[PDB]
């Protein structure tokens, strides 16, 4: 896709930048023991290079990983869009997809609790157009001129650099409490799409109104909304912060696997479409960032099928330097007057000259349009091109008068929707409109199932009960008492405040349908799920029953991986270095029951750690090969429990194991309030 | 120390940049619910600023933490060397030191197993003079131009970028077992050293020779040494993966909470002196930054006091850009001709034009020295000072000469070691005396305790069994066979490959002191331990017990955590955010045996969890008031477990659990 | 002075934009080029660039950052900072604020006013208001610069828009040039005049001092020197700048003739005891000293033999002495009041050819 930019280095011999081949081991020096010399320009090109690699990391999203894919069109949309990457049944359009966190540096672990990005370009033929989004569907602030306020509150208190990448202390909550617009994002975070199980099991969201303009001129209000094929599921937080410590890379490491394992994750393209004349129709204003319609309200539309089946080549050059705008937009559709949008809009073509360090930032292969580019734009720092046109003025004779203007009549130019108006005073006010930060989060809320909801209150809990401030823990519990009553004094058991009385203003009852994770159903595919099989070298019999299993699961997509004291034929991963966090499923088989009731090959107790752990959070468990009271005894888990396994027959036990990795999650092991 | 540039913004209404009142909160729209105005110059002044305020992360040692203190001098140096800040008793010196990984990015986890920087900037009378130390005192190559491939080994791999803050991939492993000048600080990487309890408790090495220059223009070869004086002590591996998740800002808080308290670090600054023509008298070669000189050898020489004391007041403008270099060095100390030094002088220069995006970087107020400037050098984006002479060349007559030439005789000129020569060929050559790569490393070993040298074989086993390839297993094999045979034997055991049979050119049996952490002793303090006590609110002798036993440690400087199930007066700490990585010893207060037999409130089994890890971590544990330590299956007569009636007693024999610090017994040891 | 970033966006209580949109898209870039200049954000950070009050805000970080910031909570809104820095507006801390009659109404539109569509009146009231050398001034400039112009297209264009400001301009141009004039279009043409934006119409400068006066003098003769030193002090006590022109440097000369030429003066006077200069030396190039008369009359500017011999300099520069602007006394006091007043007048207009 890129190939044309690639370079080889699988032959031939060192060179300098420049084509003069040289060496790159051994300083030049003034006999064998002496003072290196100036006049060494191998050195020193080589270092320079070293001295230079790294660039500013993203002000937000700064940690994340991208794949390349294609997005297919499942209909000539012509009926309510121009947009040409839209205009025909089966027609193929490039992409490259980044995901991240939000609030962390570049090395931060992927499975802390946050907002996740995901931002998507499509390399269309009609130029370059980015959905810019997120995996929750609304924002913390109403105005793109709060930004810095909200990411300095969530970012790192600025005298010692202390928490990364968490908002559990308390500036962020602070903010939050003094900023109630928040309420409805954080409700989101403080939920399991804070912790996604992976980039490929959770959506995304443009966030935004935005609209669809016909050629016609005619305009329809759209959300756009990327729906995973993967099915949506989510970590539990416990899990999650030892996940963040065994391994932080889990995120791309389980993205780029996938990938190269022929089983590319797959989002259906749709949006909302209403009418202009419903801006205001279903009880919140479109242009309000932190409202979702619910899809009773207004159904999703299918356009296309979005696929990553393409790892890249050079992280550097692809993933780290790929810079999205939501300023690349494309004639068909056209921004609304949100303004948390309408500064975005400014924030993304500035930032990029802090990253690239100059202007040519779109020159970059991973910018590069993939039609021909036709503008006066010349110079700068980095320019790549070498411009024939002498002549680079607007309006002119001396070349003929092109580039030609483009518009709506002539050139397939972008435009913005005709029928768009302003009225009134100059103002920065804030729309009345906007002024209920609480209803929508009990909604979502409401939404979730009992034991979602007392996961939610349970990440609360830990976070505020980190604020040292009092005083901002008393504001804390004065915004969610807004939302919900019940709420509040969930919370405030933990942190030894009372609640204050209820304020019913905001509350109701009602539910919207698709926000809850663990009320989605089972998962659609189980392939790529991890099975972790706990066996041992001191049986042969051992090492034959974790065989048999995975044969029977490797057929099914499953990644298997079989754990034993040390490496050997057959086995993937020794204890030292498995956990649970590893594996959606943990089984072990009879043989090795001996290492669950002390070596110096693992940590003292490790194996029964790892089963322990994987049911304490939520996992389908299990022994294979007939007893298994002596394992799941030591264990303390129910022989009886739901998605606790136990079978002599190896069919039969990864039949029922099976149903449970689609299950994901048992949720009766969770304690409620 | 930097009052002057500091800003204060307690009082007053919001500006401009340019001291113009603005507000900032929300945008200038056409109309209430219209579009924003490119006017608005609120809005862009802002969020020009917010778009642009990272700069580049450190090429190496991107992940670290700083503070500000005080060298103090124990006599009068003159003698040794014409150093301003070592010439007289007493005298003091600001410096700043930070703190660092070596491998990760920014945000990633102080906890990852690395080699870690230590840099120290004196801000002295003759110019700043930067110490850009590590903690293990041998680097990995021999020649500066290597840097770039050591680092690319042991970054993530470039097409994914895994894995991160880690050598446990294929292509370090790989470079290690075809560069085996690697192996001496593997070793140490492998050892406790790579994880160290915290910046505290771990040492300072200027890794080189370096010359002291006295006045004379006589010169003696020199190696710094920073010796802890809150002892050395280490995490073990298993605990410091779950604190890489539970707290990757783990060394950088205890740092902060220690400077806090009252209670800054303290090194003692120490140097190995010996004669220049005793550069090959010690079985190795001085130049070669992969050798140690054994303290047998050379005894430490005690320079001075290095305290840290003070706390940045915002860490961007401090932290993050400090920027060190080994060029900033001062009268009375040289260079050697070790060819990992030497590149390392170009490359500290180049680098902080990509850091600071301009040539102006000693301006910013972290950087400037406190002694007056007097030099030609001009312009330059982000140029911060108005130069009144505007004959800024030599030589001149209009400038009446001005500056002066500073050297050996007048100003007090930076003198290049009088006596330093050099002869022979211009090679790009490697001294057939830096040949032996592996003695060193075998003396490293020798010289770790059983349990020690245990754990150095269990942290090699880790990382081999997660590389792929197996030739790069086995060429990891060859080289750690030609150290020691049974380390390669021990290691090949975990990965289910035959250790090549032993070669004995290398192998010795001699140790060296000093370089041992487990062997070291206890701790000579106690203070800023921290101590978790875990309780219930579901008696009130549970809690009686807590408070007593908090009043009568933290009257020995000991930093308590009680731990309940929700907080309340005398509750710092839920279950639910409690975790025994956050503790250097725990206690369970009998009143709160019944937790330890679920809740809405914390993970099910999250009391016993935290009290079972800690013990099974090798850390002090004991219950005050049988039946929690049957529970937890941790053995009344254990070393390092406690169990008392009386709190007085109790206290008095952990404290010595802490000193103790880590429990090696609890560790199984091979064959 | 290389450093200085000045911005309309630089704006105060007191002031406000309107909705030119030229000025409107200004306050975008002049704020985004200093990031191109100084290399980073922090600009206004430049001792020149510096307000002379205190700075409140929550801007942080950035390469080059000067500032150390005490507030650890700079966000809003905040307690944990007590809600500062205050937010200012109309009502509170002397806010910065938008004119508030001003307001916005109609489609958003890529399209240009109708009221803006007037190019070619105001160019010919300008060109009404200039006086006629001044008028033919400007003709000269344009039939320099046009006839630099290669493309025959472009020039025949430029006369088409040339004729709609002005019919005798554009036929006075072409004349130069060689192509036509297109005919008369009388719509944009008028007789109207404005004052002020004349410069030959402003009449005598309203002081001469800093005005450069080159004596051109001669170290052949004793006497020439005595003269120049004479004029020297009696010009030099009003406020001129005086520079004594000789062969070679020494007490009392300023510059060689070398070194010396007419565009470094705004008025040139011989001493006549150096006529003989004005009829070869290897001290200067072939007739120097004649030339810098003769540009300086040639250019318009107040020119002047003092000592009472001037027919051998007048004659050999081709300037009569009967001209304006040209002096000739024998007299010091009496040249240097006439020549005070030339140099006012500044420059003489009536050595220029009309069309
Ligand atoms: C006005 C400032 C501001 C506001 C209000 C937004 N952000 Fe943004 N966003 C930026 C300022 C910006 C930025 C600082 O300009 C970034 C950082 C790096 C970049 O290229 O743009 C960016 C990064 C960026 C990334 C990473 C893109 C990538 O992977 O490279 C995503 C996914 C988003 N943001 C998504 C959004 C969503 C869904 C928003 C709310 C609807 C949002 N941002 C509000
Ligand atoms: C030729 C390249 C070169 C080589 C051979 C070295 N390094 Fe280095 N080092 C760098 C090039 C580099 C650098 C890339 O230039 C850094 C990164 C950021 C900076 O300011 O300098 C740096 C960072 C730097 C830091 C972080 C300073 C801070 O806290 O800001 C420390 C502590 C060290 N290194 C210490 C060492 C030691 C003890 C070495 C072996 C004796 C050494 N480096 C070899
Ligand atoms: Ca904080
Ligand atoms: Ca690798
Ligand atoms: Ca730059």
């Keep these: 896709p890129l190939a044309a930019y690639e370079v080889d280095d699988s032959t031939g011999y060192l060179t300098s930048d420049v084509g003069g081949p040289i060496q790159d081991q051994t300083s030049l020096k003034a006999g064998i023991r002496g003072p290196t010399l100036l006049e060494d320009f191998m050195f020193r090109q080589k270092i320079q290079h070293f001295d230079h690699e790294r660039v500013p990391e993203r002000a937000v999203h700064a940690r994340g990983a991208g794949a390349h894919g294609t997005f297919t069109s499942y209909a000539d949309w012509s009926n309510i869009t121009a947009a040409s990457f839209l205009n025909a049944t089966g027609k193929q359009t490039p992409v490259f997809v980044r995901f991240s966190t939000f609030a962390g540096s570049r090395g931060s672990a992927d499975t802390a609790r946050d907002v996740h990005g995901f931002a998507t370009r499509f390399y269309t033929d009609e130029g370059n157009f980015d959905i810019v989004g997120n995996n929750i569907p609304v924002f913390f602030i109403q105005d793109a001129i709060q930004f810095p306020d909200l990411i300095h509150s969530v970012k790192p208190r600025p005298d010692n650099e202390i928490p990364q990448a968490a908002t559990a202390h308390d500036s962020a909550w602070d903010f939050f409490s003094q900023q109630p617009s928040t309420m409805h994002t954080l409700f989101w975070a403080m939920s399991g799409h804070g912790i996604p199980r992976s980039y490929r099991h959770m959506d995304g969201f443009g966030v935004h109104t935005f609209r669809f303009v016909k050629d016609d001129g005619s305009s329809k209000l759209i959300k756009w909304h990327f729906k995973s094929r993967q099915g949506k599921a989510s970590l539990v937080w416990e899990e999650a912060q030892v996940l963040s410590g065994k391994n932080a890379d889990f995120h791309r490491q389980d993205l780029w696997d996938a990938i190269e394992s022929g089983n590319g994750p797959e989002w259906d393209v749709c949006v909302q479409i209403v009418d202009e004349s419903q801006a205001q129709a279903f009880g919140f204003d479109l242009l309000d960032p932190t409202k979702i319609i619910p899809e009773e309200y207004a159904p999703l539309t299918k356009l296309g099928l979005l696929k990553l089946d393409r790892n890249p080549t050079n992280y550097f050059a692809e993933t780290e330097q790929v810079m999205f705008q939501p300023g690349h937009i494309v004639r068909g559709i056209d921004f609304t007057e949100d303004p948390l949008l309408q500064g975005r809009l400014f924030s993304y073509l500035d930032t990029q000259l802090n990253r690239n360090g100059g202007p040519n930032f779109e020159q970059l292969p991973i910018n590069m349009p993939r039609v021909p580019i036709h503008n ?154 991890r099975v972790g099989i706990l066996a041992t070298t001191s049986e042969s019999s051992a090492l034959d029953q974790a065989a048999q299993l995975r044969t029977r699961l490797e057929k099914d997509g499953l990644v298997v991986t079989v754990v034993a004291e040390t490496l050997r034929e057959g086995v993937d991963q020794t204890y030292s270095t498995a956990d649970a966090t590893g594996f959606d499923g943990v089984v072990v088989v009879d043989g090795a029951a001996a290492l669950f009731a002390s070596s110096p090959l693992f940590p003292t107790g490790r194996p029964l750690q790892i089963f322990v752990d994987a049911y304490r959070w939520g996992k389908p468990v299990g022994v294979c090969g007939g007893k298994s009271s002596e394992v799941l005894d030591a264990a303390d888990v129910p022989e009886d429990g739901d998605g606790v396994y136990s079978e002599e027959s190896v069919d039969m036990f990864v039949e029922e194991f099976e149903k449970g990795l689609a299950t994901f999650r048992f949720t009766d092991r969770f304690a409620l309030d």
């Design 376 to 529: 006066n734009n010349r110079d700068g720092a980095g320019q790549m091109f070498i411009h024939r046109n002498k002549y680079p003025y607007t309006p002119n004779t001396l070349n003929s008068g092109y580039p030609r203007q483009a518009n709506q009549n002539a050139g397939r130019g972008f435009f913005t929707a005709p029928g768009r108006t302003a009225s009134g005073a100059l103002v920065r006010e804030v729309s009345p409109t906007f002024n209920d930060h609480w209803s929508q989060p009990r909604l979502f809320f409401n939404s979730l199932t009992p034991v979602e909801q007392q996961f939610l209150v349970n990440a609360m809990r830990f976070e505020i009960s980190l604020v040292k401030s009092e005083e901002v823990k008393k504001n804390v519990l004065t915004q969610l008492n807004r939302v919900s009553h019940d709420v509040a004094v969930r919370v405030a058991a933990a942190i030894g405040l009372g609640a204050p009385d209820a304020d019913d203003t905001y509350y109701h009852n009602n539910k919207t349908a698709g926000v809850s994770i663990v009320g989605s159903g089972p998962l659609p595919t189980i392939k790529t799920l």
